[PDB]
Design a binder for this molecule. Structure first.
Ligand SMILES: [Zn+2]
Ligand SMILES: [Zn+2]
Lengths: 102, 102
C-alpha cells in the first residue's frame, strides 16, 4: 500500500520540482523517475511509496541507488528495479546503521 | 578501545556521582555493560565501541541494548559471546528501517 497517493503519477511528482534549486547537481527528472517528489524545503525529497526522505544531493548521486541504499524494502523500488538490484546495493553497504551511529 | 581511563569497573561507577535518581536503571547494571555517564541527561557511552545510549525506560537491559545497537563491540562479545549478540540481532532485524520512518 502507498504512503502518498497524490504523487503516484510521474507527472504529479515532476510537477513539484517547479522551484527546485538550480545549484542542486541531480536533476528533477531522475528524481521523479525514482518515485521522489520535492517536499518544498531545501533539497529534501520523499518517495511516494515508502515515505522515505533523501537530502544533500551531490554530483554523481543516483536516485535509484540511494533509494536502494536507504529504503531496500520499498514495494515500488523492488517492482521497478528488481530484488537483484536491491540485494547488490545492500551488498555494498552492510554497515550503514553502524556508520550512522558514529 | 575508545576511552582508556574508563577501563576499570570502579572508574565507571565513579562517573555516576551526579546520576539522576529518577532514571529506572541503576549505575551497577550500566557499569557492568561497559557504560560510563557523560554528565548530561542520562547519556551513557561504552568505554570500548564508544556507542552511546539514552532514554532509559523501565525494564531496559544495558547488555541487551548494547547488543541491539552496537553488536560489533569487542567488549560486548568478550563478555557475552557471539551467540548472545546473534540472538538479540534476530529479535530486531529492521532496526535502521524503524529509525528512518520518523
Ligand atoms: Zn520508496
Ligand atoms: Zn561497547
Amino acid at each position: 500500500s502507498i504512503s502518498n497517493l497524490s504523487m503516484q503519477t510521474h507527472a504529479a511528482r515532476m510537477r513539484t520540482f517547479m522551484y527546485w534549486p538550480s545549484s542542486v547537481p541531480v536533476q528533477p527528472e531522475q528524481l521523479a523517475s525514482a518515485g521522489f517528489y520535492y517536499v518544498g524545503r531545501n533539497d529534501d525529497v520523499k518517495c511516494f511509496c515508502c515515505d522515505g526522505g533523501l537530502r544533500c544531493w551531490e554530483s554523481g548521486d543516483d536516485p535509484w541507488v540511494e533509494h536502494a541504499k536507504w529504503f531496500p524494502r520499498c514495494e515500488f523500488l523492488i517492482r521497478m528495479k528488481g530484488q537483484e538490484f536491491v540485494d547488490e546495493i545492500q551488498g555494498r553497504y552492510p554497515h550503514l546503521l553502524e556508520q550512522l551511529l558514529s
